[PDB]
């Protein structure tokens, strides 16, 4: 198994908001829903690292950090991000990260 | 139980 994060993203919330309608309509069962979420996370973690080419950096002040369950949570405030340049100001940003070690 | 290291006479 792999890490379980990407339902909180834009594709993930639309994913669960589409799968719950199929749960209500009976178009998918619970085991099939769990394994399709697991294989979605697997394929996202597989193809998010090979055929993409963008850069992004952030500089700011962290208001909160946290480390338990081998995840890192950050709440940085008044931070500027640079893409590829293109600079975007951020009032508040939350960062959730996992380790490089394979789970299970 | 097996001997870990051994000497080889070069030939």
């Amino acid at each position: 198994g792999y890490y379980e994060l990407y339902r909180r993203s834009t594709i993930g919330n639309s994913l669960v908001d589409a799968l719950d309608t199929l749960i209500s309509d009976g178009r998918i069962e619970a085991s099939l829903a769990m394994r399709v979420l697991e294989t979605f996370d697997k394929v996202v973690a597989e193809t998010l690292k090979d055929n993409t080419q963008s850069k992004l950096t952030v500089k700011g002040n962290l208001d909160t950090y946290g480390f338990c369950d081998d995840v890192w949570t950050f709440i940085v405030k008044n931070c500027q991000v640079t893409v590829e340049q293109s600079v975007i100001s951020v009032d508040k940003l939350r960062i959730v990260a996992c380790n490089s070690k394979k789970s299970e | 139980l097996r001997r870990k290291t051994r000497q080889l006479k070069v030939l």
């Binding site: - | 097996r2 870990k4 051994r6």
Partner: protein
């Protein structure tokens, strides 16, 4: 006799037992560690220094026979050998014959093996190339 010994017999003695091979078997309880290692230390060319002496504090300087006689030192010179370090690994599959390959850790590199006492007026001694006036400067009898 000493010139023949230093020129050829030292190298012959090194080259008869130049290589030394030690095999570390896998000793594998599980098949995840089925590798056998083969560490070879190989001697090569031997070099002889000019006659020298190292003092207490690590200072190494050229030693002359008059100084050795006065200070009760051994009129000797250092012997160095080339040592090259082969290492091999093989997949320790039972039944199948082991085939070893280098991991390219072939380090090689003169290292000190001891001091050979030098007979005077031989090809290694300082007094062989010295003229009569040079012998008088070195306080050696012509």
């Amino acid at each position: 006799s000493f010139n023949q010994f230093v020129d050829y017999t030292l190298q012959d003695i090194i080259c008869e037992d130049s290589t030394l091979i030690l095999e570390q078997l896998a000793q594998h309880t599980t098949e995840s560690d089925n590798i056998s290692r083969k560490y070879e230390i190989s001697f090569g060319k031997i070099y002889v220094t000019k006659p020298m002496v190292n003092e207490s504090d690590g200072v190494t300087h050229a030693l002359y026979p008059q100084e050795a006689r006065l200070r009760n030192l051994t009129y000797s010179s250092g012997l160095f050998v080339d040592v090259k370090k082969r290492t091999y690994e093989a997949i320790d599959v039972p039944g199948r014959e082991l085939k070893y390959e280098l991991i390219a850790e072939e380090s090689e590199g003169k290292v000190f093996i001891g001091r050979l006492p030098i007979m005077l007026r031989s090809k290694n001694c300082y007094l062989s190339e010295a003229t009569e006036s040079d012998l008088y400067k070195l306080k050696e009898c012509p």
